[model samples]
Target: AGGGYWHTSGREILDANNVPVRIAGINWFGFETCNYVVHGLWSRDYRSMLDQIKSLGYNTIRLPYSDDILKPGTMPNSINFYQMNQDLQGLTSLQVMDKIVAYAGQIGLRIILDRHRPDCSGQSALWYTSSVSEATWISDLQALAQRYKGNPTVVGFDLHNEPHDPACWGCGDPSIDWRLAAERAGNAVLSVNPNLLIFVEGVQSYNGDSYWWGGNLQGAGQYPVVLNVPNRLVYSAHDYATSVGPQTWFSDPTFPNNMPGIWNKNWGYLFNQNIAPVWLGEFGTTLQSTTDQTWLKTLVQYLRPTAQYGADSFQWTFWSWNPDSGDTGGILKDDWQTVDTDKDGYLAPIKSSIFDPV
Candidate 1:
């Protein structure tokens, strides 16, 4: 019943022919950093990097960019022709993304655009800042939505990355309420391109307990996001072992199995309750510590189709494709050209099964 674009039906993302699309993807971050463009272009060919990702069985990519990088005068810098395609030399950051998106399409990979930050230093509680106001944020979303109007490869817009803290959920205050702002931005994009999916992230704190930014969806049960087009809404949550710290569940005797209950309480409830599809937008670990490794192992098993947890498997995208992420490392090592086989293997078993609904 859907067109060429992806849309949600209950807790599954259905394709044009109503086939379920379980996104197995990685985050290629850099445009959200000070570089104002995707990283590793200085050390590897964009085409080759994408090829490696697809070769490894990933079929989607989350490309994150900051509002500052999308500004009129912003241009990409430090790209090396020896490592990159000579033809892409001297292009603006957005131009480089255009090329990347086009290449991804040619290679059968889908793209999800993420507004990672307002300025680039780090994430902000709200979508806008002193420099990049809400008006500019909405304008940028609409601009991108209009720019890629007919492009099915650019599947959706992650309205903002990690809305947190003062970013209250369900509150009526526009300055602090992320849900209201997401509605505003989501509707704005839908106005231009209703074909695209709208990825809405949960907040860090709700009901007086704090979690990672964009990691808690406890409030969603009481006050769900009322978008202009509800079917396009997909809830998202981020998780990490170290980021989670010492929670009561971690120390439970049941340990690993206890995690599903915690997940269900936080964000998995949406998917488990069949209220909406929930994407585990970000989760990663350095694998250097037994704690995180165990956590990762448990999480992977928990999200598999046969898991005794929720109704079905939860979709996810690894934290990064680059090793530059200081805390979690990445699928690729520091060389930016080599895949960390150990890390990639951790999720390999469950990768193919994520899309196979029982």
Candidate 2:
């Protein structure tokens, strides 16, 4: 009972034994893009990379992927089969996903599946598109939910990534209201597999208030996602630093001090108010500028719990682990073998462990 599943209680993600666990995680992105696989496999072996991540002290990984990779004709690209990833040669993208997930489980890291984009062409404004319909969306989600039914390593599913403009939250428009859509999709997925967690993100603009693309959860208090499975839902939000783009609080004379109010209004209230668990699904910066450095450091402190060591803090997966992100960079630098000490230093204080068993 201690190792196979997790659910939320109040604001904590409790294990089967009722022990509170934290998702100090990282986003190893790629399946959502054209690569059909994560970036950096061309330069580093997947096993070694995951080993390094666990060694650096993370308990979970937010793995992002688009439905394109699951289609019939897709093939994983940008990997070096001979020089680095010999075992992964000739495998379909989904097979490659299975391999990565198996190894992540062996290493004691939990995985959260992210439906980042409908297709590589670009992210869609709503859950369905011309080619990917709402029926297809729910069908695809059910397939994934059944794919790893008994495997606790794959813990949750982030229904869709960054629902923005035109995607209303509490509005009664079933076609565009993300909350209603999530219930439709979440309930369907839960029908097939009841153990996994359902993570619902917020909209970009709610009641005329706007924030980051997926950083606004202000509407959740009134319109919380009603999932079929109780205590298995988690709210998620994405945030960024000035390095990506300057925002109102970043430039305010009060600067970082003014930022918390903005964060609280957007996503923090979900956790602070005990309404549900909130995961900072994605946030990162190059720290190439002082403005960004202050932003990153302040957010890290905001996530801190009172005890400050091995204690529960808000769940999060840093924006990336590969250095290719044009704005946020990642935990690794160019070679993909070396660590970015500067970035790691900022996360070190809050890092959690996957060595819960090992």
Candidate 3:
């Protein structure tokens, strides 16, 4: 009966027909910002953008959004456009998202909802903020989950983006333990829509040194998230080069070659252990420096299906599709219409397999 939905099977994400599907996706961030809408909508045709994404072989999109942006009276004026649908104008943020979701499905791409930030300024170490309480957060999640029930194209919920710092893993403090908070949110979402995958990000640090927010999943082995529907659980982690300054491993004599071990130690083990599917939720850069280039190349090779160096191929979503990420440039160049070939070259190895069926 379930023919279009996606589910988790051991260490792989499976389609509704019980086929293994890897999420080769890209992030399109904007609703998480103060703008209360997606970026690039002003400069490019939304349909054309989706067309380019499909052409590029990405099977999914991790769309980030903020709770504040979903509130009434939040949509902005003066939305510049390039051949946007006349009827779609003046619609609420949710309405616009509906249009995008429907369009994405038509183009054969799935969308994963990422709760990027509680507010607009920047990311928080925990899910709840002074303005957006945990209760409101769950309320919004339930609303969205129920809203998209039985809609396979609007696939999964990446519960809260990049939970880190005070967001401890095994720690018992309900106020700060992201693991516990994730359980609460994940279970709530599943309660409404049991078919959706629950993507839970790991905290930045556990017992030892700290990394980037949602970059470390070392603690997942001992303290795994026990979800109501464990079959849909997907462990997620973020990895960056420039955003996170030089880590000890980056300077090692082994350098890029040693990264695979660090990845397994930190986050890749979940996939290897058959606990769940591990999604490298975010990893992208300009590839300007030798180190950054090496890091990217190595990471890509490691994620290839025939990967070596004791690495497992994992699902991933590049940081963005926009052209204006200050920290890391996007896949699309300044024109917002042309693809960044250099960045595309870096991802070419895994590009063709993005839509492959298993």
Candidate 4:
């Protein structure tokens, strides 16, 4: 709703008719609740924040949200989620998200509305029986899609953040069921507003297990189910510089997907066999000392051809948007205002991860 991969001109994202349009962006954190206060949603007006992103050459934003924003109830209703009561921070979820969308348009930044927490978690909320369910979650999706049906600044819905296949693909597995939920939610959203890009994530397990039998692609898969949807669906994936045997590049058995030649065989497996496009939503290496951050920039150069070809290469979100947010990939440091490190090359992997060939 806030932003996904959208072309300001409005174009297709699947099939040859709709080619990949390079739109780059970052995520902002700590809205509705001040981090220090630890009791509500602290939203700093992003009017100026967006300007900085634009200056950095990013054209999009993945606006994150907590479930309290869409809790169906009267104005100022007590947050149904218990943890939210103790630390939602102040503003309502809806208010914080609204300001981002409004200010984003003012500064011409594209936005992808992302549901980070069905309740409040970076991973799927499998802990509670009601933490995530098809009916309830889909309702939230439909609500946002309906709310911002015609807004161009609002590009698409992320559906769900990371579908961890802790259980199984489609059978009660919290990771895989959400994919189906996303498809249903996406279809419903696009049934009305077809302009939004439908971004789908692979099951959240390192290696190819998520796609192997019983995983999302094999056992609990939904690609075929949602592929038929009419609103341009892009098969998105999350990769890290740490995803392989090593977190850095120069280790061993190095080659794109560990293959030889034009890498057609490798990408074909990742593309045709996997049946989705590589959005490369997140990946970063450290330029820090002694830590051997050289792989950080090397990974960037390797993925350069992809970016030129226009695949969705969304990069790091500038440390934890909130200093102590605990998100593994956030781009912010403890103080939150200063850059985490002087390592400018840390962002290189994303800058060159799209397909430049076709």
Number of colliding residue pairs in each model: 0, 0, 0, 42
Q: Model 4 over residues 83-141: C-alpha lDDT tens digits?
A: 33333234555654565576666666666666656554344533123566666667777
TM-score of 2: 0.97
Estimate candidate 3's alpha-carbon lDDT, on a 0 to 1 scale.
0.81
Residue-level lDDT tens digits of model 1 in 73-189: 688875778834787877777888889888887777788999889887888888888878999999999999888888788889999999987889987887889988988999999
Regions more than 4 Å wrong, model 2: 305-311, 355-358
lDDT per residue (tens digit) for residues 167-248 in model 3: 8998898899888888899999999988889998889888976876787888888888988875888899888885436678
> With candidate 2 superimposed using the best TM-score fit, by how many Å does residue 101's alpha carbon deviate from the native?
0.5
Q: What's the TM-score of every candidate structure?
A: 0.93, 0.97, 0.94, 0.67
Descending-lDDT candidate ranking:
2, 1, 3, 4
Backbone clash total, candidate 2: 0
Which residues of candidate 4, in runs, are more than 4 Å off? Answer: 1-20, 31-45, 72-91, 125-128, 167-179, 205-228, 241-276, 285-292, 305-333, 348-358
Q: Rate the local accuracy (lDDT) of all candidates.
A: 0.82, 0.87, 0.81, 0.47
- Name the regions of candidate 1 deviating beyond 4 angstroms: 1-3, 243-253, 305-312, 353-358
Which residue pairs overlap in candidate 1's backbone? none
Can you tell me which runs of candidate 3 are displaced by over 4 Å?
Answer: 1-3, 306-312, 352-358
| lDDT of residue 76 for candidate 1 | 80
